[PDB]
Amino acid sequence: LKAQTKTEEFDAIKIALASPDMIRSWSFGEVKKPETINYRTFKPERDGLFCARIFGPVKDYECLCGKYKRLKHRGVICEKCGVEVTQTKVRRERMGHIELASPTAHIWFLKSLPSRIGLLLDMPLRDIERVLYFESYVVIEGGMTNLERQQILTEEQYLDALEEFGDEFDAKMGAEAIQALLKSMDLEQECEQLREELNETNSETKRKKLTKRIKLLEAFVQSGNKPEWMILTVLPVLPPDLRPLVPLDGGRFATSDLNDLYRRVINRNNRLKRLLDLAAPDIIVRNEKRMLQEAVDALLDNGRRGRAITGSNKRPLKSLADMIKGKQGRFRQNLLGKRVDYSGRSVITVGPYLRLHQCGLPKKMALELFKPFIYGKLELRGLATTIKAAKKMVEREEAVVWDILDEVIREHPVLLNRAPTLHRLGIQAFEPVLIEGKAIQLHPLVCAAYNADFDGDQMAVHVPLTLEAQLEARALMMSTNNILSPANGEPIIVPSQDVVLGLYYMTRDCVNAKGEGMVLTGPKEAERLYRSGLASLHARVKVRITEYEKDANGELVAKTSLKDTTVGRAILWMIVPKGLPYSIVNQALGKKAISKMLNTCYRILGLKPTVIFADQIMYTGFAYAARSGASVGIDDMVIPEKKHEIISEAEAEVAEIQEQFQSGLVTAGERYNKVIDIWAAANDRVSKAMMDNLQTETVINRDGQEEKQVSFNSIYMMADSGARGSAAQIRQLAGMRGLMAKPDGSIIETPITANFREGLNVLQYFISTHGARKGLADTALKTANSGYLTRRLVDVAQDLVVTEDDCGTHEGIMMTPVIEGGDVKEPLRDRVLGRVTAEDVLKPGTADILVPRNTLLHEQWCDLLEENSVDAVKVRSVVSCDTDFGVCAHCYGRDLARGHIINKGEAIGVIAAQSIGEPGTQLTSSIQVKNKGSIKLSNVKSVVNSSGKLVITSRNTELKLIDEFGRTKESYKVPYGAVLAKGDGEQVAGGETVANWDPHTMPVITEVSGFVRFTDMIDGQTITRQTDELTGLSSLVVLDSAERTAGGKDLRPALKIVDAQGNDVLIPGTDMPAQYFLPGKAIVQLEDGVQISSGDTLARIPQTGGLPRVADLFEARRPKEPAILAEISGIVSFGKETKGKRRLVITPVDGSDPYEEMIPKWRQLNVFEGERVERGDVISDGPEAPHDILRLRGVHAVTRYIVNEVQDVYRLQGVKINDKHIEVIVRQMLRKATIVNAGSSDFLEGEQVEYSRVKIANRELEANGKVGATYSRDLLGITKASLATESFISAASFQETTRVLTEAAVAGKRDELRGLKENVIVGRLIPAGTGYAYHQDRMRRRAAG
Amino acid sequence: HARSTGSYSLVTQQPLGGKAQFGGQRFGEMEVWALEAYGAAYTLQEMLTVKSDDVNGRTKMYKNIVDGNHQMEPGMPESFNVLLKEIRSLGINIELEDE
Amino acid sequence: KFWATVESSEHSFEVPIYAETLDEALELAEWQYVPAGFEVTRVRPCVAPK
Amino acid sequence: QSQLKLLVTRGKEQGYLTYAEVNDHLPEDIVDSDQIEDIIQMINDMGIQVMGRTTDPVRMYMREMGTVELLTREGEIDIAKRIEDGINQVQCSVAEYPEAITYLLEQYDRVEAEEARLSDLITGFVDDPELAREKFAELRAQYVVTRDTIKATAQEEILKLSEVFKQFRLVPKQFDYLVNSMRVMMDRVRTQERLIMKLCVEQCKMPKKNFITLFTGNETSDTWFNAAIAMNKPWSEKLHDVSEEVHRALQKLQQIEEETGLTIEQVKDINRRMSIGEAKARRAKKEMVEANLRLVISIAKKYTNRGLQFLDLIQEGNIGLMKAVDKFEYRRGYKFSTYATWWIRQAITRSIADQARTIRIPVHMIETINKLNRISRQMLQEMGREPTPEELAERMLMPEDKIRKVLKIAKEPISMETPIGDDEDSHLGDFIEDTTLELPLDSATTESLRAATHDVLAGLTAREAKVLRMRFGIDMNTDYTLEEVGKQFDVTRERIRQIEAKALRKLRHPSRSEVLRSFLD
Ligand SMILES: [Mg+2]
Ligand SMILES: [Zn+2]
Ligand SMILES: [Zn+2]
């Protein structure tokens, strides 16, 4: 079958250089005149920038002169003035051209960053411009002569060289010269010579800079382009309708600057054409050629030469490059947004009468929106004659069209959206409910997701026209279909303010009230008791309840009993459906438990029950909150009676330190700290005073004297329930508020004593001002920062989408609780749940598989793992996923707006970036065990001393508390020289002392025992004599090797352990003796001859955060003062120091070639100078560089570094983000890898891990037995990783447009789409989600027969 | 405010403030991301193609909307086409291939 | 080659310095770094197990 | 003596640099991505910026013309002398060409025969129609006297022929055509010469030393051909193979001696002489212009802001200077400076009048506008505010109603990319509504109306439907005349016109008419 000719639905795209003939192909005529219109009867002047003959008729299906005006005449060209009679739309299509007089360089290819012409010719830019401007001659194909090829000459030089050899030598100047250079160039032969050269000289720089260029060259050859085309012969002109002349009111016109530019180019070109026929002198024609070049350049890209100005207007005219680039940073058409029909917006409001799936839509709005649907639906039933009649009907607002509108509104969803869209929940689909008013009514439970308040926020509505859009809105973007956060499985529909206060006031209990102690048959007569004003809401009552359980297999079991509860809780139980135990509502129900209720309800019953439950909860919440009569008075805020004393005492305290400063007892800087410390300490007292005087303050009585319980005080109910307000906020109303700080950043030592309830004098307010201002500014800035972070994150991920189903790899990461500091800063069940196992985990007793192989771990599975004591689970991750160019479902996880495992085709990268970026607006000396357990020493070498204690000889040492269950609770790090009262496998209690040491001291101890000798220690050189004046006990202080004398600077002082015989006691179990050298500024303990033992110290040596932190993390930025690591495992050594720095000589016990590095000595050391250290050990402390982690530790280590650090940032702010998303960001980060070995691709080439692996895995079989090449994983920042994209159309968006388009053009890049952004730009179905099927099918049809 | 179908811009065909019948709501990058996060491709397509930039798509839609047929017959948004012309106005040759 | 750790301004980074000796690498680093007002912190030899 | 420190020093003293300048100077060891991209961060931390031959030709031209030595009062006479010597030489070269005279005579035969005008054939000779009609007969006479002397006495009359032909000032176009004809003839001569040459040296194996020996002076005859090949030379007997081709192509070579009335020897001489003269002329004239290139700039500095670039002005002015050099004669004693000044100024003004406008307007329009602009000056503060719009042209010599139109079109269009309020990316053209577009609602109503009218036409009789569709363009191309309708309908004329009115009536009643009635909004 014939392949094709005409236009079907196109595949991909291709970009390249254009031949002069290729340019003349698009051109339907040449524009020979600068003229535009007729100036009187405004009409295109033939052969002008605007022409009917060249481009198109001014009116649809009508000739210009007016001969053939009939729609019948089509393919006829008029005889008077040839114009084919066709729609005027073709004036937006037809191109044109201009024959240039002299060749003209294309400014994009000349002035590009690499300067394509330049590096193609291997000719410097300066020389090329020197030639183009006729400043100097350049030889071309010099042949056999005195001169080379690329060599440039001058006037006299060229004249003389011409006088010598007329022929067999050639040189020119100007654009024609560069054209000749490019045309004469033989790519093939040059390639051959470069290949011969690459193989001779062996040097890094030479062969690198050679291989790069030969790569570029052969790329240009295979491209299909040709060098000549870099110099413009023909100049294409853009369609007139894309640079319109269109008129305006008052008679004035308006046109694009492209008309001015083009007109200039045409004018100067014509003048050149005339000057050539006039045989003008060289000095003229050269000037004209330069002017032509300048004009053409100004047309293509303006601002790279002169920045030409438009007629009558100072502002520089906008060129074609500026047409493509656009503005507002990097945005090209549909990224930055665009206008959309069938849409609207308005102020938003309440409406709690609504159901979670619906929203109030104003009558007028819905009418104007669905107006096209109403038109058809009217004449469909026959209510309207024709479409016009329907228009008139809805325009007259006849009473019928309302009821006719109710039809179209019923099952047709609408899209509701807010202004700051972050996470996908920013746009949610609802079901329209006609409302009288101009305001849009929103469901309260969604107010959390939108982050929308009622203070005059506005929302926009969109109509899902096509059937597919309706079903997409209903099955995906629907409100009830997302009850959960994409960031974490926790419910986003959690009740907010009034509702939680209502349920709180319900499930609260009072000590004595109506119906206290009485019994009730059930919830019905409980509510019947309350609604009759008989029994109080909160009272202690035993009721008969029937609670169910689904504990049977797939079946509900019914049970009934007498529960001890309150009347209110019992009334509330009428709501809670089926299997949920009564214990859920038996509590006080704060904002937390009320959420876990919904959560559990979803993880037990299902979606529908959770939704209806949620609606009911909101309803009863608002109801009883209204009934509660909760208010806020001035007497609701209770100021501590003791406060006035707490001030006075504190006011006395400072005075003490005020006097000591005058008597010189304390220094100024010490005084300031003392005063600020006491004043800050007073605030805690007042604050934790008012809290006690608030929470339990109510003192009541039941059949007796007094009994006290939690207070019913309103503001406190609000703060405790979680409705609104908090401890820090109530603290400002009642107790004193803070201590402010001057703009200097330093804190003022006169804190604000008065509060909001109390008056505030002038000063205090004036001081609060800076705090306010800086607060507003800070938030306003952090908005922008969060936005930018989100942008970079979406850019780095994007096209990452679930493609395969199960890649089937056992690979993954080891999931254990974070165990930070004292106890468990995050549990195991969190980091585990929702994530399918890599391999079957086992019970403490083995040969028993509770969870087989890979199975998604849900609530029940995690509960089963919780029954058992298991502290670790291996989990498949996106970073470890073997699937190339995407992620398998069995790796990623489950979590989503639904509890089920992740679907196929969902785009995970986008929701990952969104989940990370949305919350980001909220961002800114001895071990004592807190609990009871058993001591477990991890990774430690130690020794027992003469005191019976245990001293640790290892730098890297861990202390874990493993209780009887076998789970790890406490985890700490134990420094070198620490004294343990316990050992491995011991027993301790809560608060028991285990480890002890000193921070300021780094004790150098001895494993063996014996007398202490002295070697290479000489006074005045290596050491120095100093005796204490308060005691008389001395030590000879080791003099550092910077400050030593002439020849004594070369000796390494040491303490070598000797026995009774005077021999050398060897390091246990080795041939190597034991001698411990001492560093600089290290004071000894015992002198020569004095006998010691184990544990005795030989000598004792003295000594950001927030959102930008996350930014630094994701960008993999190297810190300022990085911790140095040991590059190779071995025993460290100190060579002779040099040049203000110090050599560090590592000594491998294993092979060879002892490695030495330059470390500045000023940096305090860590590593024992005389001991071995594994690769990755800390030679010094401080922040660690991510690259160092990746290189010296590994992928699994560095990914854990990132995730743990960023989570350390977020979790500190009380923000829940599943590790998943961060892991995908990591996957995108380390995507690139630099090859080491060879046999397929190049040597040092940076290339995609997916690409490389897909190659070598193909080379492990067939091919050669294995010719496959080794590589090295590389860590790239999110912005640098985002920089790498196969699609040039996608790259033309966020990157620099010019450079991208040029580099892609010279290469002949074929953009196959396959990505999200590029498909969005070109306006077709996304290669993910709904569209994923389509693009899959086509992808299969492609590359096949 | 609200709009069904209204006046369009001359340079690039897009909804525009029309005589004070108000132009369409702007659908921004973050909104496109939101549509991308959801698995809904068609809503996004019709959003940035038929309902906005497609000169044929709009009318060819409206006729179906009134005909009782909910579909879309999309095409190349006038924007990207304009960009094809603008790019091809230079020495740059950008073409669509295959079938 | 040799990775020289240079630190200045608000932050630090490593730059490749080619040479035949650690000492020579240090000299070539400083000569090609210090005079610009850039501090030379560290010099490390390139490992790369092969 | 540091490369990096040099880069940073330039980027410190200046403070401020561009990507390319940083790429120009980089450490010997830094060629790659992270080795630059980070160095930028290094530099953008302190002294932050990121983005001989000075380019702009305003300089280079000024320097290149700055080289050329200024002339002297006497030197101008030298150059002009070189000009005179140069030109009239090619004029004499024209006068010595027979076809050049015969062409003039024939064209004049076409003039008196009313096949063409006089203005195309002549500008006048040394100076009337009668005087022309006679002088032409003088020329013809001096031709017809020399035409019979072709028999050593002719060289005497050829002089006078040249004299009378020289007395004619030809229209520049005609003269150009004559010169062209001559040089083309020479190109033909070269065609035949090269054809004959390549059949001996490049093919037949024979030296150009021996080939040109008997060639010069004959080339037409067989003296070098039939009397040659028998010479017993190594290159002689080889000439038999191609002997057909040369002899066949020789016919045209001797034919040129007829058409042009000159032997092949003479032709080349005449045309070469003309080439020498022309070259001499241009050689002097260019040298004249290059000396006066400064004057052009000095003049153009006045016209700067009129809407044309500096270099455009100086180039058009340069063209004016060229014209001045072409039409100038030193024998008149007029100073070349004050003379050429007007020419340059004229070219400048005339060019600005044209290409400084997006909408180009005629010269008299520009002048007419100028006069109004001048009148509006005097009455500005004289009227206390400004003269009323309908009081300007009273002083002008025209109907005065023009003021509106003249004041309207004159205003240049506003840049479509002009930033509008809010200072945002909002631009003027972004707010330009498309009127020429057909709104979708109307486009739908049109379709519905098509279907409707079709339905209404489905209700009539087959012939009524056919004739009513035929009367209009309904479902057909090119609605037919009432006679044509009958032509296709058999029975014709007043018949058809009736059925029309018979159809409209049946469709007039509120049963069939009620459906499409609402379309009458
Ligand atoms: Mg708000
Ligand atoms: Zn016509
Ligand atoms: Zn996988």
Kindly describe this structure.
- Chain C: Interacts with host RpoC; this interaction inhibits host RNA polymerase activity.
- Chain C: This is Bacterial RNA polymerase inhibitor.
- Chain C: Keywords: Bacterial host gene expression shutoff by virus, Bacterial host transcription shutoff by virus, Host gene expression shutoff by virus, Host-virus interaction.
- Chain C: It comes from Escherichia phage T7 (Bacteriophage T7).
- Chain C: One of its GO terms (biological process) is symbiont-mediated suppression of host gene expression.
- Chain D: Residues 1-51 are annotated as: Sigma-70 factor domain-1.
- The structure is cut from a larger assembly and holds chains A (1345 residues), B (99 residues), C (50 residues) and D (521 residues).
- Among the domains of chain A are: 634-782, Topoisomerase I, Chain A, domain 4, CATH 1.10.132.30; 925-997, RNA polymerase II/Efflux pump adaptor protein, barrel-sandwich hybrid domain (OB fold (Dihydrolipoamide Acetyltransferase, E2P), Beta Barrel); 1278-1344, DNA polymerase, domain 1 (Orthogonal Bundle).
- In chain A, 34% of the residues lie in helices and 14% in strands.
- In chain A, the strands form 16 sheets. Chain A has a 6-stranded mixed sheet.
- Helix content of chain B is 40%, strand content 10%.
- Chain B starts with a strand and ends with a strand.
- With 99 residues, chain B is an alpha+beta fold.
- A 3-stranded antiparallel sheet of chain C has the order 2-1-3.
- Chain C is α+β, with helices and mostly antiparallel strands.
- In chain C, a hairpin with a 2-residue loop joins strand 1 and strand 2 (11-17).
- Chain D has 521 residues and is mainly α.
- Chain D has 4 domains: 1-47, no CATH class; 48-355, RNA Polymerase Primary Sigma Factor (Orthogonal Bundle), CATH 1.10.601; 356-436, Orthogonal Bundle (Arc Repressor Mutant, subunit A), CATH 1.10.10; 437-521, Arc Repressor Mutant, subunit A, CATH 1.10.10.
- Chain D has 21 helices and 1 strand.
- Chain D has helices at residues 3-13, 19-24, 33-43, 57-67, 73-95, 98-112, 118-121, 129-146, 154-166, 172-198, 208-211, 243-259, 264-300, 310-327, 336-355, 363-378, 403-409, 440-457, 462-471, 482-488, 494-506; one strand at residues 414-415.
- The radius of gyration of chain D is 40 Å and the shape is extended.
- The chains are: A alpha+beta (1345), B alpha+beta (99), C alpha+beta (50), D mainly alpha (521).
- Bound molecules: magnesium ion (MG) and zinc ion (ZN) (2 copies).
- The site of one zinc ion has 8 residues of chain A, from loops.
